[PDB]
Amino acid sequence: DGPEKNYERTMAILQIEAEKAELRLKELEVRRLMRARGDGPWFHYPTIDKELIDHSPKATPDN
Amino acid sequence: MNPIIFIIILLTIMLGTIIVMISSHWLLVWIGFEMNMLAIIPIMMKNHNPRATEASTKYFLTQSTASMLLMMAVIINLMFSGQWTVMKLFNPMASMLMTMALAMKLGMAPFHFWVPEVTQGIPLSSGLILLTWQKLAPMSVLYQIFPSINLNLILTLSVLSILIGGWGGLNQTQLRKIMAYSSIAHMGWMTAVLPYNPTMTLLNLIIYIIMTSTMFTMFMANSTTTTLSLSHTWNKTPIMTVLILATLLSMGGLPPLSGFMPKWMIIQEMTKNNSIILPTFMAITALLNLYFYMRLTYSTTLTMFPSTNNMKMKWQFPLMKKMTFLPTMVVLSTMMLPLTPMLSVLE
Amino acid sequence: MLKYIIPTIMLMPLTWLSKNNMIWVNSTAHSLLISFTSLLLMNQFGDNSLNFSLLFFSDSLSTPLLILTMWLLPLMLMASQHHLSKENLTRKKLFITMLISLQLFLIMTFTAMELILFYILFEATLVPTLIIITRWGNQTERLNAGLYFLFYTLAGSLPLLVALIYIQNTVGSLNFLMLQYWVQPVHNSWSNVFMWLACMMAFMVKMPLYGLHLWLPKAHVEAPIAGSMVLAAVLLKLGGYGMLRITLILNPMTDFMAYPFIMLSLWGMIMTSSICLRQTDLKSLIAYSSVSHMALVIVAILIQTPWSYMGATALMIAHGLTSSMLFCLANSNYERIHSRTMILARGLQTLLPLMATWWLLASLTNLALPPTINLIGELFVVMSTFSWSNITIILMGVNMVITALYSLYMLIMTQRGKYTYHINNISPSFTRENALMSLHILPLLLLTLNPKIILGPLY
Amino acid sequence: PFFDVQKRLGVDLDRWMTIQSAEQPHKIPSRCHAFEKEWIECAHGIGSIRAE
Amino acid sequence: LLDLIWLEAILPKTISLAQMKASTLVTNQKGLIKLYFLSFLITILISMILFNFHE
Amino acid sequence: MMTGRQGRATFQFLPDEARSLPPPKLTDPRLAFVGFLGYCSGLIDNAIRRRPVLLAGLHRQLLYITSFVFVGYYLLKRQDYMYAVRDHDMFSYIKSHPEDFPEKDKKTYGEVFEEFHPVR
Amino acid sequence: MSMVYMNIMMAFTVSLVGLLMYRSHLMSSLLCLEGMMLSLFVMAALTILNSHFTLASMMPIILLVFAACEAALGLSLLVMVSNTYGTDYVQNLNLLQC
Amino acid sequence: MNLLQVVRDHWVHVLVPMGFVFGYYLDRKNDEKLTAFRNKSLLYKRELKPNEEVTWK
Amino acid sequence: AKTVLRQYWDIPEGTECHRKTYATTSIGGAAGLVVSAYSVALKTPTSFLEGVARTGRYTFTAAAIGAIFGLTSCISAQVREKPDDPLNYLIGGCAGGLILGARTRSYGIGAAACAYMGLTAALVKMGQLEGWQVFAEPKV
Ligand SMILES: CCCCCCCCCCCCCCCCCC(=O)OC[C@H](COP(=O)(O)OCCN)OC(=O)CCCCCCCCCCCCCCCCC
Ligand SMILES: CCCCCCCCCCCCCCCCCC(=O)OC[C@H](COP(=O)(O)OCCN)OC(=O)CCCCCCCCCCCCCCCCC
Ligand SMILES: CCCCCCCCCCCCCCCCCC(=O)OC[C@H](COP(=O)(O)OCCN)OC(=O)CCCCCCCCCCCCCCCCC
Numbered sequence A: 001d002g003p004e005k006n007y008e009r010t011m012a013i014l015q016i017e018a019e020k021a022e023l024r025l026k027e028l029e030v031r032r033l034m035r036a037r038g039d040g041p042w043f044h045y046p047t048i049d050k051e052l053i054d055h056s057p058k059a060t061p062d063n
Numbered sequence B: 001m002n003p004i005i006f007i008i009i010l011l012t013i014m015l016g017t018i019i020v021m022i023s024s025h026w027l028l029v030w031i032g033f034e035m036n037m038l039a040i041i042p043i044m045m046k047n048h049n050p051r052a053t054e055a056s057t058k059y060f061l062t063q064s065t066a067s068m069l070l071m072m073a074v075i076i077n078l079m080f081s082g083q084w085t086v087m088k089l090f091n092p093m094a095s096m097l098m099t100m101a102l103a104m105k106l107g108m109a110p111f112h113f114w115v116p117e118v119t120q121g122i123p124l125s126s127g128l129i130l131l132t133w134q135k136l137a138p139m140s141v142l143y144q145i146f147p148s149i150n151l152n153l154i155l156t157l158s159v160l161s162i163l164i165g166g167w168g169g170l171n172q173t174q175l176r177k178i179m180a181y182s183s184i185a186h187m188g189w190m191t192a193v194l195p196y197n198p199t200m201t202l203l204n205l206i207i208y209i210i211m212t213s214t215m216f217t218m219f220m221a222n223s224t225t226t227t228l229s230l231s232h233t234w235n236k237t238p239i240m241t242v243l244i245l246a247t248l249l250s251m252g253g254l255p256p257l258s259g260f261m262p263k264w265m266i267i268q269e270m271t272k273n274n275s276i277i278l279p280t281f282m283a284i285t286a287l288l289n290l291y292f293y294m295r296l297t298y299s300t301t302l303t304m305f306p307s308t309n310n311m312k313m314k315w316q317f318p319l320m321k322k323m324t325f326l327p328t329m330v331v332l333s334t335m336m337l338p339l340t341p342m343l344s345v346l347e
Numbered sequence C: 001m002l003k004y005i006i007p008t009i010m011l012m013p014l015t016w017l018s019k020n021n022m023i024w025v026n027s028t029a030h031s032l033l034i035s036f037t038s039l040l041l042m043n044q045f046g047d048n049s050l051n052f053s054l055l056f057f058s059d060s061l062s063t064p065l066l067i068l069t070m071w072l073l074p075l076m077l078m079a080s081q082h083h084l085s086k087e088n089l090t091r092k093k094l095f096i097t098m099l100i101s102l103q104l105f106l107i108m109t110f111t112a113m114e115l116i117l118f119y120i121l122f123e124a125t126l127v128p129t130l131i132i133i134t135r136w137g138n139q140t141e142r143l144n145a146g147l148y149f150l151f152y153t154l155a156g157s158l159p160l161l162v163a164l165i166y167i168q169n170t171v172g173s174l175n176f177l178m179l180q181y182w183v184q185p186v187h188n189s190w191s192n193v194f195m196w197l198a199c200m201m202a203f204m205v206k207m208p209l210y211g212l213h214l215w216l217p218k219a220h221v222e223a224p225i226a227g228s229m230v231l232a233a234v235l236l237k238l239g240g241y242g243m244l245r246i247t248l249i250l251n252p253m254t255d256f257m258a259y260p261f262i263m264l265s266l267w268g269m270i271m272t273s274s275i276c277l278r279q280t281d282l283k284s285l286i287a288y289s290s291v292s293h294m295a296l297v298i299v300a301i302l303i304q305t306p307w308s309y310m311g312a313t314a315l316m317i318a319h320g321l322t323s324s325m326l327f328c329l330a331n332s333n334y335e336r337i338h339s340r341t342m343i344l345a346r347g348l349q350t351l352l353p354l355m356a357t358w359w360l361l362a363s364l365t366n367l368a369l370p371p372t373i374n375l376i377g378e379l380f381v382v383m384s385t386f387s388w389s390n391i392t393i394i395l396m397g398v399n400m401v402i403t404a405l406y407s408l409y410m411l412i413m414t415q416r417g418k419y420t421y422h423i424n425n426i427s428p429s430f431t432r433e434n435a436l437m438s439l440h441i442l443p444l445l446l447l448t449l450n451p452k453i454i455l456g457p458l459y
Numbered sequence D: 001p002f003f004d005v006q007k008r009l010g011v012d013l014d015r016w017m018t019i020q021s022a023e024q025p026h027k028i029p030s031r032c033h034a035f036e037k038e039w040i041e042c043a044h045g046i047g048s049i050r051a052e
Numbered sequence E: 001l002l003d004l005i006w007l008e009a010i011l012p013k014t015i016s017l018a019q020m021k022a023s024t025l026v027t028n029q030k031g032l033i034k035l036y037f038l039s040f041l042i043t044i045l046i047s048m049i050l051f052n053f054h055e
Numbered sequence F: 001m002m003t004g005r006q007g008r009a010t011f012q013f014l015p016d017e018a019r020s021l022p023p024p025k026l027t028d029p030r031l032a033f034v035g036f037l038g039y040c041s042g043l044i045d046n047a048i049r050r051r052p053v054l055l056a057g058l059h060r061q062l063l064y065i066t067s068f069v070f071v072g073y074y075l076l077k078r079q080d081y082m083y084a085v086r087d088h089d090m091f092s093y094i095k096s097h098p099e100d101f102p103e104k105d106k107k108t109y110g111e112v113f114e115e116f117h118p119v120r
Numbered sequence G: 001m002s003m004v005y006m007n008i009m010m011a012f013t014v015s016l017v018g019l020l021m022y023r024s025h026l027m028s029s030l031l032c033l034e035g036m037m038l039s040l041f042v043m044a045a046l047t048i049l050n051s052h053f054t055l056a057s058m059m060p061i062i063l064l065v066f067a068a069c070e071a072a073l074g075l076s077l078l079v080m081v082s083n084t085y086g087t088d089y090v091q092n093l094n095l096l097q098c
Numbered sequence H: 001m002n003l004l005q006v007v008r009d010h011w012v013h014v015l016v017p018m019g020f021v022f023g024y025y026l027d028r029k030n031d032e033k034l035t036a037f038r039n040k041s042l043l044y045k046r047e048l049k050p051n052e053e054v055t056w057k
Numbered sequence I: 001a002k003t004v005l006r007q008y009w010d011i012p013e014g015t016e017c018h019r020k021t022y023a024t025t026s027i028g029g030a031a032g033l034v035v036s037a038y039s040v041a042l043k044t045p046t047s048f049l050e051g052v053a054r055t056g057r058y059t060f061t062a063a064a065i066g067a068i069f070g071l072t073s074c075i076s077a078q079v080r081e082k083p084d085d086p087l088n089y090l091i092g093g094c095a096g097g098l099i100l101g102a103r104t105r106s107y108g109i110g111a112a113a114c115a116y117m118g119l120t121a122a123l124v125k126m127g128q129l130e131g132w133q134v135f136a137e138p139k140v
């Protein structure tokens, strides 16, 4: 292969690897925030479903 | 046993575990454990000898004590939260009790003494159920309550399990005792990563089950339960010695085999959380397990131990044991590392 | 690299599907053809490395190591087929399979772009190497040798795994090209001290570093001849190749973290060279000779100069051919007298004239006669180490005197004097043995004509 | 649940008994019905990290 | 003095010796239900009094 | 971490949104490796039962390859779906929290000071 | 908490200590196991009854049923041990030591 | 027999040579996936020659 | 343990050595009692006085190791005026190792205990300086 093909093949390799590296650093930062704040789709630990509640008038009034 | 009754009992062992895994209610989780314990005792007793009776009794006492502690934790949780949902516990005392109860059920150190003895005292097929299927229900519970688990407690149980499992296996010549200590050591890896990434707990569990299932199946194929009886395999079924070698190296966590994958992925998750000392200690201590796996490979595959004259009679008959799924399991036990990214299906 | 990986993989079905009596002919012929095609890796550029894909690349450092690796496979098949002649067919084929799998792991190891891909293949080479030592070694001690080999390597390489993953979390990549541009200086803290040790100890154990070398005299001595050839010629150089790569991300801490390991190497080379003078086992002497030579490579890598890096690359290649030749020469006597004791068979020049010429040529390259590439590598390292500190010339000078002494002591004891009277089975050298020796020494002396192709990326 | 078979199949195996503010026989309310209702509705959907 | 002795003693021989000793302590058990469950009681008491795992 | 995803259709192997992703190619190198594992399992099955390894029971060997490739195809579809979901979640979060992921004003090497450590 | 819980929790603790500190009879340890269940039944019933958790009123029954079934299994094992050795002493159950 | 038996004796000798051809071919296919900067680097970018359509393949 | 450790790390290095020693003696003494409890439970003593003798022998050894390490390391930090130095612990850790050899009456164990306890103690001090986490809290 000539130097030009290897040179520009290297640039294509570097671009992919640089893009993956930035995404890897971004994922770690995103995970740290989500786990700290709980405001994301990850680390979403379930709470009790409120459709289970019965809203009918009960046997007694105060409830 | 009547074969139909044996099938019904196995299906009940599975039903108990499935109930634990689909239940949203703590009472149904407890019932699943009770059903599971009831159904497994007969398969331990099935060969009727004093050793099988002692193992069944030791197992019953350990599991019943664990299940009472589990119920105590559930009731304390009810008193402090007024609800039964399988989720994070709402009292630190309840968390400690349930964590200890599940550690007792898993045979984690220092609640481990029953695993070597119970495994030794029962047939190989029963030991296969005990060391693989029986881990599923306790792990599935730990998977759901981990946010409320005390970090120091669970990591302490993990470190001790890796240490005790590694040291315990060094002094063993019985195959069933070796697999019991290997199970204890592998247990510590699963729980060590649980606080950080429960998905890697599942990955290690699945791969551990596959490799352990492969080992028991090959031990059953030749009816070998001791190191020296396994050392005759080269002069009966040479291919089995090669398969045993590959699986033992895989269980040792050597690249490029499948057993390296869980160790590799657990180390990654712990380092992402700035846990450097603990994964390094765990990785080094796991060399103990590699040592007594390698000792087995020396007596089975890499050298030729003395045979007996009557072994010549065995040459004239074929293997007639079923060895179900063995070709598939041994391939998965060894050749899966190139497919490691597939672990995302567990997410 | 697929043009080398796939043909290497095909050696396995070739071995298994061949006629029973053609397993050695077929595998030897086609492994030589693969070795011939490896010369296409010599398309190196002055500025940029030859970067094939996301997974693999080759620069002037890995290219000579790859050519050596692929050259060694046919030589090992030739060296093994005599002492495996009574092995049953299936076990012969499995022996060849282990050699092929080792070559596959090695050529991928030397071209891996990502340090964690390098790690997996770097550990992968353990498995076939352990099997070769323990299954086909001859003595009881092979079992113990395998354990020392395995656990010395893993004790070091498991901390390396933690370090590498830590680096990927912090930098975002372990791709070696990326690390050349994103590398940051290492601050001097206790935590970085142990990162440095984690990144280096695994490679130090494989060199081996003096103090951590006890596995080598066991493994190199108990292995079968093919095992010794690859262990000394190539596998020791994984440590050197790994150090040459990973030091990129360890500056400037290497300035002071090098001192304890430079002292171990500079003093260790004199210690191990002295040991050679009193060894009674010929194979053991050759094994201790390797430790002394690799001490120079460790020192050269740690002082991090353009001259020391060229010298280190040349020495690794030069030592690979020489140490493999010496093991093959020693093995040819062993196949006759069935002992490794050096004083047992004397005066062999009288009985085996041409073989005594190979001994002389092997000895002269071992003591680095100019203009051999053994001398070129050693000289470049001595030059750079003199600049690091003039006083080092004393330790380098003493080592060269001792090296000449044990190299010619081995020659004189075995080849000269009077033959042993009762040893009467020294049959003439086989064509196979003579071809095996000349396929070591001929390439070694030819490289003297064009040394630049083994001087590495700093050339 | 580890495997949420109940939600997939839409069958209520044991959810009916998990909380005290769910439907009861003859609409008998638990003593803390109002408090449990208010806590469940507050924490619903936001996850346990936020809810704590 | 160095190669065959001290370089063996300071690392492989001593590390190997310690693991063997630890292994016999772990595996020298009497197989008694009474003692194993007595150790459980110690574990639970330690976990609360010393390490406060219940909090 | 992704257990409670807002759009997690629970206990579904491949939720419907996965159908928007390109399927694995039948020539996928990972699928080819899965088929190879199936072929190895077929050879091992012959070996342990002492049949001629390469020729015995070609029907059985074919079902080993097919079943591995068949199961492998769906596992790869889920694998690719789970990484697509991870990226989708990551980018949505970054958009919703710009204050946490600011674009850096990044300088040339002519402006930034790096210490020189001579190697001598 | 209310005063009664102190004693019910003490009873569970006492029976748990009794369970973990064996003497000789395997039977005496099974009784401690049943004692643990009795204290759980009482504490569960008190919590459920006092809170008027109506649907949970069935839970103590399920607890009792499953624990009695597990006690039947324990008694069966004890009888098989007594058949082998002629006593229910736990010191005879030490074969698996080796 | 000629041709046959000869082929049965010596057909294994195509394996490694066909491995090299296949390995060579796959190496070219990987190069077609790394064309993002073909004729776009600052060092070598140029106008295409009249007939020519890509500077390298 | 949480409290005794907190007390030890509150005292600045190379000062109030008497209070430093009291903390390390308690940590060592507690470890000895824990070891005694498992030993007595798993290897039944022949008699009640035999078991009390074993407990005293194990507890005294651990407390003696804990006292010397705390005393030796605090004094080294004082005469060198180097509070934040791992060498102080390295010295304290070896002194505790030599005590272990003396109690076991073995030179070999003493030398091995010196080397490994000394390095372990030094690593502990490095970790405190650099904030190394053994049981790291989950973050990501
Ligand atoms: C980071 C830098 C790394 C570089 C420095 C590396 C230093 C060298 C490390 C050497 C490791 C130990 C030595 C390994 C050589 C092989 C050991 C050996 O062969 O000893 C033999 C000894 C005799 O017993 P045995 O062989 O079983 O009897 C015949 C029945 N087979 O066998 C035995 O008695 C049992 C031997 C058990 C030890 C197995 C090896 C495990 C090594 C890891 C130690 C784990 C430590 C974990 C402890 C944590 C708690 C403190
Ligand atoms: C036999 C077993 C074989 C295995 C061998 C294992 C070797 C492991 C070696 C690990 C040692 C790593 C060093 C850890 C100490 C901390 C290093 C540090 O951060 O100190 C910094 C300081 C640098 O000093 P300075 O150069 O003045 O600073 C720049 C200004 N010019 O520090 C300095 O002053 C730099 C000097 C550090 C090196 C000290 C050398 C001690 C003397 C040589 C010993 C040779 C090795 C002895 C091995 C025996 C083992 C039994
Ligand atoms: C129609 C009937 C129904 C069944 C049809 C199913 C067919 C497919 C199942 C797989 C079988 C593949 C074909 C196997 C051919 C075996 C023929 C054979 O055994 O003869 C031996 C032959 C010649 O050997 P010979 O010269 O006689 O003696 C040499 C002495 N050493 O030696 C040979 O030449 C054998 C060559 C090796 C066999 C081919 C290897 C195939 C590799 C498959 C890779 C799988 C990849 C999957 C990827 C899929 C992804 C989509």
Ligand SMILES: CCCCCCCCCCCCCCCCCC(=O)OC[C@H](COP(=O)(O)OCCN)OC(=O)CCCCCCCCCCCCCCCCC
Pocket: I033, I034, I036, I037, I038, I040, I041, I044, I045, I046, I047, I048, I049, I050, I051, I052, I053, I055, I056, I057, I059
């Ligand atoms: C000379 C030193 C001067 C004194 C200072 C040191 C003492 C500090 C105070 C520690 C508490 C006392 C420790 C004594 C424990 C009991 C010793 C013992 O072995 O008891 C005898 C008994 C033997 O059983 P057996 O063979 O059946 O003979 C029966 C004879 N009556 O043994 C058994 O049955 C074993 C079961 C009972 C023991 C349970 C384990 C708890 C005791 C562990 C040791 C103490 C550590 C725990 C307590 C710390 C708080 C004080």
Ligand SMILES: CCCCCCCCCCCCCCCCCC(=O)OC[C@H](COP(=O)(O)OCCN)OC(=O)CCCCCCCCCCCCCCCCC
Pocket: I008, I023, I024, I025, I027, I028, I031, I032, I035, I054, I057, I058, I059, I061, I062, I065, I066, I067, I069, I092, I093, I094, I096, I097, I104, I109, I117, I120, I121, I124
């Ligand atoms: C001291 C410096 C340490 C600095 C921090 C780093 C911690 C290092 C941890 C070292 C762990 C050492 C483990 C040694 C195991 C003992 C092995 C042995 O051989 O001891 C035997 C001895 C019993 O005597 P023996 O004859 O063997 O058996 C009698 C049978 N009836 O056994 C016994 O008598 C009982 C053994 C108890 C050993 C416990 C020692 C721990 C001491 C902790 C002191 C540190 C204080 C806290 C410091 C906090 C700030 C750092």
